């Protein structure tokens, strides 16, 4: 189920309570929560 809702969620000027992952090493096995945040390592000079 999905329905439009900015009249409740879009605080004017910008809402910042909503965040989503962008970079992860592995594609995500179905039905798991991966809360923890760390830093991504790309090729040489890995970053932690």
């Amino acid at each position, epitope marked *: 189920i999905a329905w439009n809702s900015n*009249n*409740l969620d879009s*605080k*004017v*000027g*910008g809402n*910042y*309570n909503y*965040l989503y992952r962008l970079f992860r090493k592995s594609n995500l096995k179905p039905f798991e929560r991966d809360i923890s*945040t760390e830093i991504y390592q790309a090729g040489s000079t890995p970053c932690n």
Partner: antibody, heavy 122, light 108 residues
């Protein structure tokens, strides 16, 4: 219990700049939310801005745009505030607030610093 | 910008009584609000957020209500620790503002 503590009293002069800072003590830092607010004596509280103690984000006010800045130090787990071009009005008491904990951000201040006193005089 | 004004201003009471506060908004608010207690010479303490919820560690007396614009706080019995101002915070939009201040005094 999370607690916030910060610097003592200050006195400055017009045109100068001042740096107040508060140290955090929280059970986890799940994108913590140090979040500044000020109070002229006997007046309405006024809200400064919020630093994203997770990484670096720096949403600020609009009445105070272009002259106030905020940073934080990860290792010390403190929050840094900076204001310039002061003037006799900004005489106030300055506060640290924030500290959601369960979710990552709010916009309500649930952990308050014990207050910092700033006097702009000549 | 959102304006926040509280119609009651100062109020009166006596121990063991109930009080009410009104917080009106210039515009529509979707039940985004919080209520802070501030004793003189101290730091603010939060009581209610999202206009309804009761935040932990507080006496059960406090209770929020209301939606839309007119918002209300209410306590059943008036304990001594209730003797200070109370502010309402909007957080519907950007720059977040505050109220005016609503103090209560013993009446005799």
């Amino acid at each position: 219990q999370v607690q916030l503590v910060q610097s003592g009293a200050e006195v400055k002069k017009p045109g100068a700049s001042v740096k107040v800072s508060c140290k955090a003590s929280g059970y986890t830092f799940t994108t913590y939310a140090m979040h500044w607010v000020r109070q002229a004596p006997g007046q309405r509280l006024e809200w400064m801005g919020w630093i994203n103690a997770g990484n670096g984000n720096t949403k600020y006010s609009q009445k105070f745009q272009g002259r106030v800045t905020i940073t934080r130090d990860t290792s010390a787990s403190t929050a840094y505030m900076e204001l310039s071009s002061l003037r006799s009005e900004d005489t106030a008491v300055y506060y640290c607030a924030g500290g959601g904990g369960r979710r990552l951000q709010f916009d309500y201040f649930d952990y308050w610093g014990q207050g910092t006193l700033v006097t702009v005089s000549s | 910008d959102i304006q926040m004004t509280q119609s009651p201003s100062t109020l009166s009471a006596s121990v063991g009584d109930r009080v009410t506060i009104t917080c009106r908004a210039s515009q529509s608010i979707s039940s985004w609000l919080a209520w802070y207690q501030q004793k003189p010479g101290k730091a603010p303490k939060l009581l209610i957020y999202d206009a309804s919820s009761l935040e932990s560690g507080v006496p059960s007396r406090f209770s929020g209500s209301g939606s839309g614009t007119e918002f209300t706080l209410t306590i059943s019995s008036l304990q001594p620790d209730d003797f200070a101002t109370y502010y309402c915070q909007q957080y519907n939009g950007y720059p977040w503002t505050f109220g005016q201040g609503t103090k209560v005094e013993i009446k005799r």
